[model samples]
Target: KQPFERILREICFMVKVEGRKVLRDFGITPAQFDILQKIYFEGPKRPGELSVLLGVAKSTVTGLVKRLEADGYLTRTPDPADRRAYFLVITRKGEEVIEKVIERRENFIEKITSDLGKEKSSKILDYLKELKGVMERNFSKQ
Candidate 1:
């Protein structure tokens, strides 16, 4: 029916809703969670680095990160060798919430295996990868 994109939209929205529920549990918004996640995976970063990644003003990022630091999700690193002089690092508390969010989402999706059967569920992943490859190539030209 050529409605494949519509199906993806619906599924993505539902998944977003579920992810939001997890954020609510931790009392944080999506933006705050993203900063935590970025630091967790990318390791410590300077304020300006996260500013570019977060797509916000440097001062805005400064205050937001300060709030995150106040909440004990992040701490600072002193490095005289680095030009920036300091970096933001995620604490175990920050890492823990990120882990919990993923575990919760994965646990939610894990039920799909029973509904779709394991073979079809795995096949869906393969198809999604192929579709993503085409989508990426299509966007890369633009």
Candidate 2:
């Protein structure tokens, strides 16, 4: 509550640190898990779309896809619609990890809310959705 100026940065840092720890415990990093989860829940998407959605450069997404591919987590396949283009598809292994991580992440949140109360936590979620909407609009312009 220190003026709320650095709250976003501070919260982001702590959340990333804690998230990294949680991901490490599951044998993945936040980045890797994200690629998996995006493919899992968002469905197949081109590297360009992934780049835009992930707020990263196309080259960055390409590199991420390469890393995941090397780990046997995802596959880069030719886009039938555009043979020159490629789309990232989750491998079976990747899907499994996504499922596991999603389950664990939910469980983690559930434990946090155990003391926080579900109704209160749900209200927080509404606020988060509002924030997410604002940020999405802001980022889309970049």
Candidate 3:
């Protein structure tokens, strides 16, 4: 049998390639798409919080937010209670882009799995979920 690491690495790379293709049409980087999804689903967040969530430097997040804001995908709102902080808000355009990306990805998955039969798909999905939970639990300690 193939090593688990090799299998996992190839799957990760394939997913990233597919994601990049989807993002290319929307004119956003992978990081920007991630930022939009987080803010869209979790509400706005301070730049520092986004920096931590995305595992990037504050300056990096600052540059990204500036570009996204300029592109009309995001907006910066002054914090009501904090004079020095602002929240990054995903605009309606940003939300629509995320939904489009998600739908496209879902369709890709559906097409790939259509030949696998529902039983095999369910089993593969269950294994993937289990693997994800295991990885998350172990990675969190590091």
lDDT of 3 by residue, 31-83 (tens): 88878889999999999999998999999998888999999999988999989
Candidate 3 runs further than 4 Å off: 51-60, 132-142
Better of 1 and 3 by TM-score: 1
Please give the ranking of all candidate structures by lDDT, highest first, separated by commas: 3, 1, 2
TM-score of 2: 0.59
Per-residue lDDT value at 103 in model 3? 77
lDDT of 2 at 46: 82
Model 1 ranges with Cα > 4 A deviation: 1-6, 129-142
Query: After superposing candidate 2, which stretches have Cα over 4 Å from the reference?
Result: 1-22, 109-142
Model 1 accuracy (lDDT, Cα): 0.84
Choose 2 or 3, whichever is better by TM-score: 3
Query: Regarding lDDT, does 1 or 2 come out ahead?
Result: 1
Q: How would you encode candidate 1's per-residue C-alpha lDDT over 20-125 as one tens digit per residue?
A: 6877776777778878889888898888898999898998888888888998989998877966589999999988888887787787788876789989998988
Give the Å shift of residue 86 in candidate 2: 1.6
Each candidate's lDDT (Cα)? Answer: 0.84, 0.75, 0.85
10 residues in a row with least lDDT, candidate 1: 14-23
